[PDB]
Amino acid sequence: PGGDFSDPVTSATLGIVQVFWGLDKKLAQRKHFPSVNWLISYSKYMRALDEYYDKHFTEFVPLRTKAKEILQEEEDLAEIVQLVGKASLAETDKITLEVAKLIKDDFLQQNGYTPYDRFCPFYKTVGMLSNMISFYDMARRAVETTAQSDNKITWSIIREHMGEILYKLSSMKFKDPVKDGEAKIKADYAQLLEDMQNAFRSLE
Amino acid sequence: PGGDFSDPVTSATLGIVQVFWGLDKKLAQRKHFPSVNWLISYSKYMRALDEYYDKHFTEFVPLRTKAKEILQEEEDLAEIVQLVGKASLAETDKITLEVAKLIKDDFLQQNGYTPYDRFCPFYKTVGMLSNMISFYDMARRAVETTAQSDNKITWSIIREHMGEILYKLSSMKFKDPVKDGEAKIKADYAQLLEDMQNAFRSLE
Amino acid sequence: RGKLIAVIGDEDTVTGFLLGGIGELNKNRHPNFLVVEKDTTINEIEDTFRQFLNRDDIGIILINQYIAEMVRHALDAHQRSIPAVLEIPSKEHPYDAAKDSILRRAKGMF
Amino acid sequence: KDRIEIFPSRMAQTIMKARLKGAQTGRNLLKKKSDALTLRFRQILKK
Amino acid sequence: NVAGVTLPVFEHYHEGTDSYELTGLARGGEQLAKLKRNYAKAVELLVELASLQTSFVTLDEAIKITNRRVNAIEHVIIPRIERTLAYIITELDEREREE
Amino acid sequence: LPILQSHSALLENMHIEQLARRLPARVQGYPWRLAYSTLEHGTSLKTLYRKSASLDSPVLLVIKDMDNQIFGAYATHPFRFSDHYYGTGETFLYTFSPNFKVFKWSGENSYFINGDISSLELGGGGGRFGLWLDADLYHGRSNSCSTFNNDILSKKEDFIVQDLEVWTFE
Amino acid sequence: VCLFLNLANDPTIERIITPRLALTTAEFLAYQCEKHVLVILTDMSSYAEALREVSAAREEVPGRRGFPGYMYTDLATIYERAGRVEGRNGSITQIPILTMPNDDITHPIPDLTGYITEGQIYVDRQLHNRQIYPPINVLPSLSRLMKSAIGEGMTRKDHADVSNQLYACYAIGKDVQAMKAVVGEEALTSDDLLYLEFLQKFEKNFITQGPYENRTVYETLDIGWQLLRIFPKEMLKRIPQSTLSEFYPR
């Protein structure tokens, strides 16, 4: 009642269930389907599924960790953006916020009313996240590697010289498993990895 | 028991009575009398009584409505003045609060134990409220009629140049239906309408 | 009644504003300005700044930017709203905001 | 310390809900005052 | 007096009488006339800059006072009320189970 | 030869020329700048006042009624609230009916322009107005007034505005 | 209309019977005479008081805040005698009017109603004291199924967009009236001054109606447009550009 989780049936249920998918009216009012709040939500099952991911998806454990960290950092950085404005953040923080926006806009949202997003297989999901976090690691590497240099890297330099990679990253959700096989989707995602590697190598 | 109308006997009464005169500890404690809270109280008989007022007191229904409108605006204005101080109020709101103090202290208020107030006949009562709301309409009009002009009327200018009128308006309750005929009280209240109009013509 | 501006600066900065019409003696024959000759001790400058900010007739103090770096302790200790202080640039001197006290108070400053 | 200690009754429940609406209103108005002053202050800094 | 806060500023005012009127009469009075205008224009800008500063310092205080009231409501007054109301709802259920 | 407007309008190029032929020498040959429009801005009297209150120049009023008739006035000053009347003898009312018609000052009175709290009005002659508009710029009235000896201008003495614009010279 | 009148002093078990009696008639009319019935229940709080009395007559122990434990099932047994049905044109709508005790929606009468009914409409003492009739506050009101009552082929196709934008302009206008209290009128932007004028005109023309004025949905949407038309076209952000090009031009 009123969203108060301390209510006995809700509180007892949340005391027992190992996963809570915190759907949130605020995300639905923004049309952010599927409208799952990633701060309120939790899962206890990671420790078991880590065996399956280690066997079949060995890159995923880093990726899941980094994604949650980026989102948690953006929630803290948004208070600094309110206090002193976005332009006042450090370059590492700005690129973290921009990638967190990419995750929020083109990973965490999913247009289930349309064929490309009606379902999203795990091979597609891990592949999309592998690229977004590879972009994060290389972008943040280029920033931190050029700290105290004359020719310092920043998100604006990346957006100007290689903004095609951000466009491609947002475009990756539109791949459809019914048209193109998972091997072809994975090969296109591997080409975006090569494209961004060559783009970052072109700067530092 | 607590003075709260949430009690089972008041609650079962309010589901049945058509008129309720909620005597309020805040008004009784400030010795405002008769202490009847004009926001909590109601009378559902107004529908049936409009056929009487629109035959014996044809000016009254517009006055009754504008009186409640003033008293409700004063409940907003008083709250914001407590929260942030009065300096932000527009001149229309200063006048709304001033006439709300005239109504609240010199119409709505009545003393139970003095010959001025032992009984206030309806011809006296409508004549009083007619004058106070005619002052409200004319005072608010005078401001709005001189907004954007080369000189603007303000509540401070009104408080000076209408000072004798404000004292006369607050004094209307002292007319005595035992010593003064109803025609005399009505004639004095008609003179107050003319006095107000001629005093506003000195400002406009 | 109106307030007066006061000046701490070199001979040219004082002379410039004096011709700008700034100069007034208080009735006690004390001026509203100090000419900082190179030989002037920083304590005499600071005492002048303290006298000017604590005076009731003075409403603004202009401090040449190089002096503001020397008297910086008292200048940053001064925090009243009315007696405003302007650190100002000049012909042989640093830029218009070199460690400016107001821009250091500001949250949105870069 | 932690609570106002009005004694538990349906009266006191209603009084606390009324205080909560008063306090949440007071927060929102004083937050609007702070936002307007913050905007003017940032405008003044730019000027 | 915007948003109920008094902000101090300065108006530039001029006394007419030039105390330096005859300076450089024999030589340089052309450039000195340009100079006294240029430093009067400098002062007029500096009095506006000082009015920004007097406003700025007063806004900085008024924001801090307002945010202390907002935070006192958000972290003291509302939490006392919400905990008082949760205690009331609990003890009202205790009276209901006793009855 | 015919004037250029800064944007599209209620008027055709033939209407623009027919009005431009009547301009006084203070504004002849100037391009026309949009001051207010129900096609571009909020449909209310306060918006028309606010958008005009920063001006200090003559204006052209244009109206289309719900009966598709076009009419308005040239006026020597911006529209605003007014305690008394204001404006001068170059002020005139006009219509397309379907031919263009103009109603210059009669010389009878100075009752050119006024603005109330809740209306905009032009002309005088007792209770009559050569144009009147409500606080929404929705209802309006138009009849022969002694300031201009004008026709009805709208299709009917009482009318509803479909759309309204104000233009100035710059 | 079929009208049932249980008076305040009529015997309390007849008040328990009255909704069952009325709904049995509405079920006959709707599901056998194919009618579209609307059932209006005029004060479920006085029915809830009758459950409490008939419960005490059985000597049942009082449940939550003195009402019967099964009050949820009894309200469902009233309220769920409603809906369309397969293979029949007829239907029953219901509008249970409900006097919330102590002005508090947390009370078990409105609480259990809110669990069963698809939405609520709130009548507000603030609008009533402002003399706005009907004093229906459109903000805390929510018709849970309005999105499936209206639009193309059901009303005019603009309706969903117009209602969302009227909600935004009223909500923003209330927020601006709360800002005007703080900043003073001269500090308001032109946009804020439009939203404050929308609030004044929306209460005086949309919400204000009077007790014998009947407005079709079309006359209501026309009033909706003649109000929204106060804004510059670009400010109507909750309405699609297609709907604006069809209905914003007056």
Query: Which residues, listed in sequence order, are joined to residue F122 by a DSSP beta bridge?
Result: F113, F131
With CA atoms as reference, report the closest residue to B185 among B117, B133, B125.
B125
Q: Does B33 carry a binding-site annotation? A: yes
Judging contacts by C-beta atoms under 8 Å, the chain D residues touching residue C108 are: 42, 45
Contacts of G181 in chain D (CB under 8 A): 29
Alpha helix (H) residue ranges in chain D = 10-46
Amino acid at B75: E
Residues 6 or more apart from G48 whose CB is under 8 A from it? G67, G71, G75, G108, G109
Contact C18 E20 (CB under 8 A): yes
Would you call B90 helix, strand, or coil by DSSP? coil
Chains D–G, number of C-beta pairs less than 8 Å apart? 18
Q: Cβ of E35 and C88 within 8 Å?
A: no
Cross-chain Cβ contact B2/D26 below 8 Å: no
Shortest Cα–Cα distance, E20 to chain C (Å): 7
> Using the beta-carbon criterion (under 8 Å), do E18 and C21 form an inter-chain contact?
yes
F104 beta partners? F92
**Cα–Cα dist A90/A97, whole Å:** 11
Q: How far is CA G230 from CA B172, C62, G170, in A?
A: 44, 51, 13
Q: Say yes or no for a CB contact (<8 Å) between D14 and G181.
A: no
Given CB atoms, is D27 within the 8 Å cutoff of chain C?
Answer: no
User: By CB neighbour count within 10 A (0-12 exposed, 13-18 middle, 19+ buried), where does A29 fall?
Assistant: exposed
- Angle (CA) F20 F22 F25, round 5°: 90
Please answer whether residues F117 and F110 qualify as being in contact, where contact means their C-beta atoms are separated by less than 8 angstroms.
no
To the nearest 10 degrees (0 to 180), the angle between helices G190-201 and F45-53 is 160
Provide the experimental method for this PDB entry: cryo-EM
G185 touches F: beta carbon within 8 Å: no
Helices (H), chain B: 8-14, 25-29, 46-56, 60-84, 91-106, 122-144, 155-161, 163-171, 182-201
> Would you give the distance in Å from CA F60 to the centre of its chain?
5
Q: Enumerate the residues of chain C whose CB falls inside 8 A of the CB of residue D42.
A: 108
Beta bridge partners of F167: F34, F60
How far is residue F143's CA from residue G175's CA, in Å, rounded to a whole number? 43
* Measured distance CA(A186)–CA(A201) in Å, rounded: 22
A70: CB partners within 8 A, 6+ apart: A96, A99, A100, A103, A133, A136
Where do runs of H (alpha helix) occur along G5-155? 12-31, 44-57, 71-79, 108-116, 125-129, 146-149
d(CA G12, CA G18): 10
Residue appearing with tokens 């307007």: D36
C45 lies within 8 A of chain E by CB: no
- Which phi and psi (to 5°) does residue G36 adopt? -90, 105
C108 touches chain D (CB under 8 A): yes
Only one residue has tokens 């609650």, namely B11
Which residues of chain G make contact with D22, given a CB cutoff of 8 A? none
Spatial neighbors of A104 by CB under 8 A, at least 6 apart, are: A32, A71, A74
CA angle (A17, A20, A26) in 5-degree steps = 155
Element (H, E) at G175: helix G159-183
3-state secondary structure of B67: helix
Residue of D1, D5, D6, D16 for testing the chain E interface, max E β-carbons within 10 Å? D16
CA-based nearest distance B199→chain F, Å: 18
Nearest residue of E to residue B83, measured between CA atoms: E69
CB contact under 8 A, D36 and G104: no
Which chain G residues are closer than 8 Å to F41 by Cβ? Answer: 232
Task: Provide the 3-class DSSP secondary structure of residue C61.
Answer: strand
Cα(A46)–Cα(B118) distance, rounded to whole angstroms?
81
Tell me the DSSP string of C2-18: --EEEEEE-HHHHHHHH
Q: Residues in chain G whose beta carbon is closer than 8 A to a beta carbon of chain E?
A: 62, 64-65, 182-184, 186-187
Shortest CA gap B8–chain E (Å): 15
**Would you state the structure tokens that stand for residue F142, as one six-digit string?**
């138009």
**Amino acid code (one letter) for F64:** K
Q: By the 8 A CB rule, do G107 and G65 touch?
A: yes
Give the CA dihedral E72, E75, E80, E85, nearest 10 degrees: 130
3-state secondary structure of B140: helix
Interface check for E60 against chain G (CB to CB < 8 A): the answer is: no
In sequence order, what are the beta bridge partners of F100?
A: F96
Residue whose entry in the numeric block shows the structure tokens 């029949």: G88
- B-chain residues within 8 Å CB-CB of D10? 4, 6-7
Judge contact between B177 and B121, C-beta under 8 A.
Answer: yes
Q: Please name the residues in contact with E45: beta carbons below 8 A apart, sequence gap of 6 or more.
A: none
CA-wise closest residue to B36 among B20, B51, B16, B12: B20
| Interface residue B80 vs chain D (CB under 8 A) | yes
Specify the residue for token string 């263009």. Answer: F100
Pair F60, F96: CB distance under 8 Å: no
Of E42, C5, E26, residue with least CA distance to E34: E42
3-state secondary structure of F29: coil
Kindly list the residues of chain F whose beta carbon comes within 8 Å of any beta carbon in chain G.
Answer: 38, 40-44, 46-47, 50, 136, 138, 162-163
F4: DSSP letter: P
Which tokens belong to C55? Answer: 């005076």
CB contact under 8 A, D30 and B83: yes
Helix, strand or coil for residue F122?
Answer: strand
Q: Domain ranges in chain C?
A: 1-110
A110 marked ligand binding residue: yes
d(CA F43, CA F162): 10
Angle between helices C11-19 and E29-72 (to 10 degrees): 100
User: The domain containing residue B120 runs over which residues?
Assistant: 44-204
Contact between residue B197 and residue B163 where contact means Cβ atoms under 8 Å apart: no
Domain C1-110, architecture per CATH: 3-Layer(aba) Sandwich (3.40)
Q: In the complex, which subunits touch C with 3 or more CB pairs below 8 angstroms? A: A, D, E
Query: Residue by residue, what is the 3-state secondary structure of A152-201?
Result: CCCHHHHHHHHHHHHHHHHHHHHCCCCCCCHHHHHHHHHHHHHHHHHHHH
Which residue pairs from B172-181 have beta carbons closer than 8 angstroms and sit at least 24 positions apart in sequence? B172/B106, B172/B127, B172/B128, B172/B131, B173/B106, B173/B107, B173/B110, B173/B116, B173/B117, B173/B120, B173/B128, B174/B116, B175/B116, B175/B124, B176/B115, B176/B116, B177/B119, B177/B120, B177/B121, B177/B124, B178/B115
Q: How far is CA B187 from CA B125, B163, E17, G102, G235, in A?
A: 14, 21, 65, 46, 55
